[PDB]
Amino acid sequence: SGNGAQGTKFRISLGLPVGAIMNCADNSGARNLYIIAVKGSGSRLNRLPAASLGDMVMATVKKGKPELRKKVMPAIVVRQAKSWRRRDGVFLYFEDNAGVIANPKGEMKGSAITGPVGKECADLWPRVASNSGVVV
Amino acid sequence: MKVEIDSFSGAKIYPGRGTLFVRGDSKIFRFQNSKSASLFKQRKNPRRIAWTVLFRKHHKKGITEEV
Amino acid sequence: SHRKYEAPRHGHLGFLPRKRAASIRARVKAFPKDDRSKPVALTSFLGYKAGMTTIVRDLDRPGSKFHKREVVEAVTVVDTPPVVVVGVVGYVETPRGLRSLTTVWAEHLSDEVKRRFYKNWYKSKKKAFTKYSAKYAQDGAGIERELARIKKYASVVRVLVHTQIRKTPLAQKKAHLAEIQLNGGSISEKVDWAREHFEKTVAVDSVFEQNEMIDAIAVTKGHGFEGVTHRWGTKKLPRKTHRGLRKVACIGAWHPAHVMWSVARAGQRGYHSRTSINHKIYRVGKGDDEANGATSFDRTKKTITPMGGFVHYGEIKNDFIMVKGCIPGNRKRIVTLRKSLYTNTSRKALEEVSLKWIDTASKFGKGRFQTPAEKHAFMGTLKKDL
RNA sequence: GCAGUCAAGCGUUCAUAGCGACAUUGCUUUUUGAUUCUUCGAUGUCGGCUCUUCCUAUCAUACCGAAGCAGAAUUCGGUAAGCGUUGGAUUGUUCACCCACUAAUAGGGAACGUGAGCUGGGUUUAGACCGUCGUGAGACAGGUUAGUUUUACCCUACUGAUGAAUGUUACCGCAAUAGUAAUUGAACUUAGUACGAGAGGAACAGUUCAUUCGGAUAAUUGGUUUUUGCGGCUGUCUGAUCAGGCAUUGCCGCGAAGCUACCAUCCGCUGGAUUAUGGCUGAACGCCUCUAAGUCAGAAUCCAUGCUAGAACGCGGUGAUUUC
RNA sequence: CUCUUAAGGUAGCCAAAUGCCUCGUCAUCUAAUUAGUGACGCGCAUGAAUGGAUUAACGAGAUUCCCACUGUCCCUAUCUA
RNA sequence: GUGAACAGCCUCUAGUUGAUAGAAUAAUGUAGAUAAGGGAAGUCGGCAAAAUAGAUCCGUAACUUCGGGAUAAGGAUUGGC
């Protein structure tokens, strides 16, 4: 899952279809992120591509810095707000939906992550884990 | 394997049962059921809900044998 | 003209006709290929779906992220009282098929299979297998004649067995008869085994063991006449439709001037026979054994039965099989548990599972307790009990 | 529109790796025309939505052959339609053009599939506006705005459901025939390995996961909620209290059971015969040759295994078969 | 400069409900816009009571974008009569 | 009676208790509803539905024919004793 990503990911429930605004958790200047596409699931008629924790999406910026706005960039989902089951059997969810701006290889435009991060994303992306303080 | 406690009610949470809510503070809340979860979202106080461990402790109900 | 967006086929055509099964007891359409070197054993068994529960166990899957870590897999419980053998059946090979040549019964049949042979038992003189019990009459001359016919002929051999429904908590009183194939060398040895086991019982401990992958053969839960949308998964039409939206819009093209077999129409959903394969056994338990629901890690004397019983079924006072996952059929249905036909080697099989905990909390609600002792400790004294 | 023959030339050299002028032979009926056979006592003439099937001139996937193929990427070609071929901005649009994902975003047919299946945005009645034209009434494949979409209970087909008769009734079975389903990708390792001057840069085996699809099931999570189950709230009525009625399921919270969700979980088999192609032995052709006799391996192919139904005029085995 | 008219289209306005060519060109709006807005204008064929340009308020008028809100949709499921 | 109210909701007087019924709870419907996460991606078009909603207090822009816009926008409060 994801190019430049260390490892695989077990499926977790999709919360973030295309068209979706999630907050930004990085210090990049951006404030929100509009998910326009998802790197991953390919195709079904009338099925919107949707994202989960740990997924690498194509995103724009609606509110934030002008030098980030008006151009598509990659992003990584770090919080979901939609309950998902871990194999250990706890359904869990965050208060919000949240992402960080990235490059295609997985590195971060930012240097800090405000708020918590799921260990799924933290494990699948090591550069996120570096800049991540709290995990779950 | 471990048995967690409901933050709201004090009930034991066996595996594969309940929910976990991570807040923006990164404070983790555990719920045995949607009842306690919904009362939490409604922002009710366990000390005032009568079926809760906190209530029964604060009102000195039933325990009477530990302290 | 062409479809304009190439999407895939709704539904599976090899599960047609989506009609009602002929009986609640699904047919075993195949048994494992016989190996005429192993001992003589049954290839399948009969049980009753009791319900479901939750299981903790540690995973032993290297390369997985969650190796040597716990998981919460689900399981179906099938109550499986000992199956009792009442008959012997011989099949010889013909260019038109395997054909039954003769079938031998036991001397004393119970009032459950005798019940199976009737539609009105309260009115009857209960005259069945009387002249057969009288055909025995000194030594079984005609009976050994028939067994010798089976030994001489009979490419394959099948044993007639039935269930101990009275030990089961159902209100049925009428047992389920079934033919089960015997696998092992020497059709002679097979039929001698059967003759030895006439009137006698057979328990799952001899047929199934831990970590064995099995197939489950049952009749799916019925849901009556259903519409195309939930029966086939068709897209709902929009809100703006005159004359329904929960429909298929184009029921075929002009030419061929017919409705095809392959377009989705409405009809029966459920009460189909289904065979679901490669469900691992997680526990083979014994009603003789107190602490069926206990574990090496838990060490609390408790049966698998939840507080308040299995919903719509009852308690488990017999042997049972805890099999991974979800199994066709609803509670109280006769399930036929078959041994796998092919040798699986995948590391999902061959994985010795060791349970860690079993959920025995009430399924008639959001159960918070696993034992009434736990409840009494947590709650304390009540107005009752006092 | 698609495909061939020919071969001047291009391609450092070299006609044919890949292209290919001058010419020429053809297929196609998804273009547009030509025609006017049918239909004017009416075959509902755009497009989209929905669903199924088919074809193949194969976009991807499987297996291969060729290269101006070192690797990687790419190009040409073959057997192959088994499986799949998307989400969106603008436009009524078919078409088109961009963004993005993807293994890939191939083309087409079925009364230019599909209106008693929808819609009705367009076109193409009647109202109205403009511009040009016209003395005018009025005209305009020019623009604009508004503008009733009827009927199935019949036969057939299809999906499901019963059923007389074949001594009666009951149980267990067989199996013809029909159907059939699984799909694709990423990561790790193989391996900074092979290959290469270097830049760069694989693959088979194996492991873990995921995509699309399908079949089930409901332990859990979520939803639903006339359990009108518990509680609470408003107005009014029952003198008050208790307990209740009405408010077209009065409202709110929780809510068992049941139904249910890629919003949840489980599962989705193994062999044989072959295509292409590569080969064996071996003549024709006292050498050579995969081929002519014979033969080996071999594809997502075919047939079985397996799975579904079961012949209501296809079978078998067994039980009991009625006197007061 | 020349031909020519009764006069030769004035002030103003515009790809407008009027612009064929046309999805005109530039900018803005979007990730992406045959839409929208702002500008440009030898304008097939704008134009002054066959009224021109503009306009606060009003509009079950036509239209674009934003916020909020939602089963419109992803993707359907359940309940009642 | 509630309430600003001849609104809606309930009641007294007065009048009706009539409209074919019974049994069941399949699909599809008509009418009413609810839905996790997302939130107009749906559609020609946000069609439909949701959301807002009374009163008190605060606060209120551009533009303007100075009259309006304006309930602009946007916020707080509300029970019983």
Q: Mind spelling out the 3-state secondary structure of chain A? A: CCCCCCCCCCCCCCCEECCEEEEECECCCCCEEEEEEECCCCCCCCCCCEECCCCEEEEECCCCCCCCCCCCEEEEEEECCCCEECCCCCEEEECCCEEEEECCCCCECCCCECCCECHHHHHHCHHHHHHCCCEC
Whether residue C368 lies within 8 A of chain B, CB to CB, comes out as yes
CA distance C247 to A79: 39
Half-sphere exposure of A48 (CA within 13 A, CB side): 11
Q: Which residue has the tokens 């490892």?
A: A7
Q: Which chains are within 8 Å of B by 3+ CB pairs?
A: A, C
Q: Which nucleotides of E are covered by protein (CB under 7 A)?
A: 29-32, 67, 72-78
CB proximity list for C124: less than 8 A, separation 6 or greater: C118
CA distance C202 to C141: 27
Query: Residue B33 and residue C370: Cβ atoms within 8 Å?
Result: no
Is strand E in 7 Å reach of the CB of A136?
no
Q: How far is B22 from chain C (nearest CA, A)?
A: 21
CA of residue C273 to C1' of nucleotide D179, angstroms: 16
Q: Which residue has the tokens 């009460």?
A: C271
List, as own/partner pairs, every contact residues C18-22 make where C-beta atoms lie below 8 angstroms and the sequence separation is at least 24, other chains included. C18/C231, C18/C267, C18/C268, C18/C269, C18/C272, C19/C267, C19/C268, C19/C272, C20/C222, C20/C268, C20/C271, C20/C272, C21/C219, C21/C271, C21/C272, C21/C273
Q: Is C149 exposed, middle or buried (0-12, 13-18, 19+ CB in 10 A)?
A: middle
Q: Give residue A124's identity as a one-letter amino acid code.
A: L
Residue C359's nearest nucleotide, by CA–C1', is D219
Interface test with chain B among C73, C368, C379, C381, by most B beta carbons within 10 Å: C368
List, as own/partner pairs, every contact residues C170-174 make where C-beta atoms lie below 8 angstroms and the sequence separation is at least 24, other chains included. C170/C48, C170/C313, C170/C314, C170/C332, C173/C112, C173/C115, C174/C112, C174/C115, C174/C116
Length of chain C: 386
CA distance A87 to A89: 5
CA distance C14 to C172: 34
Whether residue B12 lies within 8 A of chain C, CB to CB, comes out as yes
Nearest to C72 among B12, B16, B63 (CB): B16
Show the beta-strand stretches assigned E in chain C. Answer: 41-42, 44-58, 70-71, 74-79, 83-94, 97-105, 156-162, 178-183, 201-202, 213-219, 225-226, 267-268, 273-285, 320-324, 334-339, 355-358
Both tokens of residue C195? 């003759």
Nearest to B24 among A83, A93, A115 (CB): A115
Collapsing DSSP states into helix, strand and coil, what is residue C356?
strand
Half-sphere exposure of A31 (CA within 13 A, CB side): 6
CA distance A55 to A33: 14
Is strand E in 7 Å reach of the CB of A70?
yes
Q: How far is B53 from chain C (nearest CA, A)?
A: 10
Q: Do C263 and C248 contact (CB within 8 A), yes or no?
A: yes
N-term to C-term CA, chain B: 29
Determination technique used = cryo-EM
Is strand D in 7 Å reach of the CB of C97?
yes
Query: Residue B1 and residue C357: Cβ atoms within 8 Å?
Result: yes
Chain A CB contacts of B19 below 8 Å: 83, 90-93
Both tokens of residue C211? 């970590």
Both tokens of residue C357? 């905990």
Largest CA distance in chain A: 43
- 86-125 on A, CB < 7 Å from strand E: none
Residue C116's nearest nucleotide, by CA–C1', is D171
> What counts of helices (H) and strands (E) characterise chain C?
6, 16
Q: Do C280 and C349 contact (CB within 8 A), yes or no?
A: yes
Chain B CB contacts of C54 below 8 Å: 15-17
Instruction: Specify the pairing of strand A56-60 against strand A32-38.
Output: antiparallel
CA distance A111 to A28: 8
Query: Residue C66 and residue A44: Cβ atoms within 8 Å?
Result: no
CA of residue C42 to C1' of nucleotide D142, angstroms: 87
Both tokens of residue A120? 């799924």
Is strand D in 7 Å reach of the CB of A40?
yes
What is the full DSSP assignment across C66-94?
A: TTTSEE--EEEEEE-PPEEEEEEEEEEEE
Interface test with chain A among B13, B20, B27, B31, by most A beta carbons within 10 Å: B20
Q: Which nucleotides of D are covered by protein (CB under 7 A)?
A: 48-54, 83-88, 99-114, 116-120, 150, 157-162, 169-176, 179-181, 186-188, 207-223, 253-270, 305-310, 314-321
Whether residue A66 lies within 8 A of chain C, CB to CB, comes out as no
Q: How far is B27 from chain C (nearest CA, A)?
A: 24
Q: How many CB atoms lie within 10 A of CB C328?
A: 20
Nearest to C54 among B11, B16, B33 (CB): B16
CA distance C336 to C275: 9
CB proximity list for C171: less than 8 A, separation 6 or greater: none
CA distance A29 to A25: 10
Both tokens of residue A20? 């979706």
Q: Give residue B40's identity as a one-letter amino acid code.
A: F
